[PDB]
Design a protein around this ligand. Structure first.
Ligand SMILES: [Ca+2]
Ligand SMILES: [Ca+2]
Ligand SMILES: [Ca+2]
Ligand SMILES: [Ca+2]
Ligand SMILES: [Mn+2]
Ligand SMILES: [Mn+2]
Ligand SMILES: [Mn+2]
Ligand SMILES: [Mn+2]
Lengths: 232, 232, 232, 232
């Protein structure tokens, strides 16, 4: 029984359990703000320091994890809300793409839209070049921001959103259940083999980016985590 | 969107929001002791008053729901810790089986271990008659307690456990993630069609049965559920 | 040397192991409920019947003890949560203060809040009448409820809390580490010469007190304890 | 609050959560074995991989921590048991003393007997040079295997121990509570200022060494940590 869990009701520049990437910045309160509002093509990402082992080439067993977080996006004239937020998983050596252009890559892929990540994106700005659907949305991305599957979601300025991902390794089904402002929930799922698209040890994080014409406020609020691996 | 949401920190026998059925009683703090210990073949069930439409035959759309709740199963000599609690989903006119028999029917099935329902059971006694595993577990039950899928679980006496369930209409997946005391977490997932296996309107609830020689305590401590069915 | 250890996962009116006092009552899930909620100025206590010897005058040595216990306190309209639970150590003949008054005495002190005992008080009502910190606090008490040491704590309604308490004799330091629900721990410590405060043999127990305006649910869940006295 | 909890009921090589040093090896049943037998002057350390910041230069606050763990020492024909185990706290960039003699240093101090580290030790071999007591003892070490204070203890071949440590920041009182196979608890405490003896960030871990004449089995059955740091 190999478990790894943690809790964050407020973050802070300092706590080694958390490492920053890009323009993340800690707020007077406790929240985290990924993108910078004055930089062009900004990119921010944040992830748990110590990496997590999600499977053993020894037992072949895959790990199951339960997570949940609360973010919040918010408009800001005269720019356009973009591009959004992505909850990802990446090799223990993941850096913000080389000279990343930011924009709709969500700071996790390259210009073409690819990279070595598996995540959940809360895309608010529909990017043609990546086959985004003409509306805001929740989607599953694998080694590319050209989501494998998506789902009609609605970004609400100032709305405090709440997410809950459940990974059942016995089926390898990634399950996402978003909890909007008003109550309506949005659910998305996609059977993705982690042991096949990711290395033994990986890192869990949050990325958010903006273009030149679009910049929005990206704040992460809470992120509890627990992942158990079985070894026998 | 046609949503339905509620949250219970503690209940009562009066709050018409809850339907009590049988041995079900209510502690002096809000916990719902399902089974009675002095009675043999006891059966406790607590449905959620107001029924919920989980699919419109007109639109074919199946509702998606995210629920999380907490229970507790504490031993009591000289009996056995059987059979356990079950979070089921059954038609709006559902009632404890005609001339029930506690035991491993859990208050949802007949003698043959059959019935009209869908649920996540937390089994602690191996009743070979309905082909159960050899140890405590968590199974997904479809019109039967002879589970469709099982994962080895570990019930702990006087252990506050946490269950989070996500049903994603799109994939018709019933993701289950248990969070035992210590920290380790147990998960099991499956594909259920509800619509296929159920009427448009039903009720969500818990249940607990108790054989002749084996009785135990089944406390339901908290419960939140939010269902939504896109339709328009 | 001479050790005295025990363990309680449940209790039950019909066990010579514990003396009941006040308005105490045992629930169906094996839980000592201190205060009864339909009475003004309620005081129920509970303690190990067999008086334990913490120190002997012949040798001059004091014993060290290790104890852990868990309790649940829960809110309810229309009264306000108070006053709270207190783990205390008193003389072998310790009785509930003559003609109690409830309020911030926790069943150990009188009207002036002073008595013969030494205990840990998980406080929920700021009884300024006894120089109480303006928030749910934690503190060590020595012959009164006008704490020597206090620590901002935070009691969560309907939340299961654990507590480990250490008392080293060589330093006579009372260590206390409260583990809330969410995980963070609140701790407090102090120097206390039991030998100079309490008599050779003393009983250990729990006590909760209510008032006319305010009341709440006091649940003592489990209790294991161990103490060793050097005899040379 | 900035808590950091984890816990292992068993260990496994590779798990990025743990860092192994020296002669450390993991047994086939989840136990770690700090020392090597057929080797001379064996030293074995195991650290919680990720660093925990034990104090903030911003507020000046220390953190409190509640950790408990289980260790076992067994005799091997006809090498005398030596020297013992040590739960320590030291600067993250902590490595095994270059050219460590092992033995009475337990591999956390040099020949002289000093080193930058705080820690509780379960010493079991009279090392005149380090002013150790005449018998198996326990002690709170502060930058020297020459314990600031020790108490009599007793290593029992193949016996499993039970230790609970609590460091209350409000008093800077590190208190330990041992539990011999038989039952007697063993308390010892001391005021160590983890704010003034170490650097904001440290690593926790267990170290075990030996000699040529002295050798033995050191196993660590399970370790569970938790440390909250208030930041406001
Ligand atoms: Ca985009
Ligand atoms: Ca059964
Ligand atoms: Ca008070
Ligand atoms: Ca030594
Ligand atoms: Mn997209
Ligand atoms: Mn079953
Ligand atoms: Mn007080
Ligand atoms: Mn020593």
């Amino acid at each position: 029984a190999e478990t790894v869990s943690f809790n964050f009701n407020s973050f802070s520049e300092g706590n080694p359990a958390i490492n920053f990437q890009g323009d993340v910045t800690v707020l007077s309160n406790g929240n985290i703000q990924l993108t910078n509002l004055n930089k062009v093509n900004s990119v921010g990402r944040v992830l748990y320091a110590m990496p997590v082992r999600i499977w053993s080439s020894a037992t072949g067993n895959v790990a199951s994890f339960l997570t949940s977080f609360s973010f919040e996006m918010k408009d800001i004239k005269d720019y356009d809300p973009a591009d959004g937020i992505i909850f990802f998983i990446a090799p223990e050596d993941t850096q913000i793409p080389a000279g990343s252009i930011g924009g709709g890559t969500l700071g996790v892929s390259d210009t073409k839209g690819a990279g070595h990540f598996v995540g959940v994106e809360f895309d608010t700005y529909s990017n043609s070049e990546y086959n985004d659907p003409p509306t805001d949305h929740v989607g599953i991305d694998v080694n590319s921001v050209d989501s494998v599957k998506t789902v009609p979601w609605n970004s609400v300025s100032g709305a405090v959103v709440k997410v809950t991902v459940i990974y059942d390794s016995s089926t390898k089904t990634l399950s996402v259940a978003v909890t909007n402002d008003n109550g309506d929930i949005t659910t998305i799922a996609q059977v993705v083999d982690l042991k096949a698209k990711l290395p033994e040890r990986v890192k869990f994080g949050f990325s958010a980016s903006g273009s030149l014409g679009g910049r929005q406020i990206h704040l992460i609020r809470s992120w509890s985590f627990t992942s158990t691996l079985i070894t026998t």
